[PDB]
Amino acid sequence: SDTERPVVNVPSEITVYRGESFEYFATVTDNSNAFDLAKTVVRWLYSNQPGRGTEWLQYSVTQVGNQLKVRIFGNVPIDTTIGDYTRYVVATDAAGNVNATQTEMGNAAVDKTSVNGQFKLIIR
Ligand SMILES: [Ca+2]
């Protein structure tokens, strides 16, 4: 049995630059050492998508030993809007537990509080 949520480690903020490519990394651990990689995503609040203003945000997940490795990458178009956005690494263990639920992401967005796996995406 597994009732404990996986834990994301992600940089608190990632800064990207118009016209330029970027690459950052997050990792995930879980008590069971077993994951649901296809249900581990990088997304904005509203839907399982990179989000408005950040449609160029990409990711790829692999399992390395007992961890997931989440590569967060892309190329920022030269005419993207400059600003700061909250995004979420949402990981699922093999048993279906998630680090942050849809409910929690919504409360965090409105209340300006934090969940595990959240990060600031800063465009300059
Ligand atoms: Ca677990």
Author numbering: 398 to 521
What does the report in the manuscript say about this coordinate set?
Many streptococci adhere to protein-attached carbohydrates expressed on cell surfaces using Siglec-like binding regions (SLBRs). Siglec-like binding regions (SLBRs) are among the streptococcal adhesive modules that bind sialoglycans. SLBRs contain two adjacent modules: a Siglec domain, which shares some features with mammalian Siglecs, and a Unique domain13 with no close homologs outside of the family. The conserved sialic acid-recognition motif governs general specificity while sequence diversity in surrounding loop regions allows the SLBR to select between related sialoglycans.
Only the crystallization conditions for SLBRHsa and the isolated Siglec domain of SLBRGspB (SLBRGspB-Siglec) supported sialoglycan binding. Distinct loops in SLBRHsa and SLBRGspB showed the largest conformational differences between the unbound and sialoglycan-bound structures. In the sTa-bound structure of SLBRGspB-Siglec, the helix of the FG loop is rotated 10° as compared to the unliganded conformation. This rotation results in a maximum physical displacement of 1.3 Å, which optimizes contacts to the GalNAc of sTa. Moreover, temperature factor analysis suggests that these loops have high flexibility in the absence of ligand.
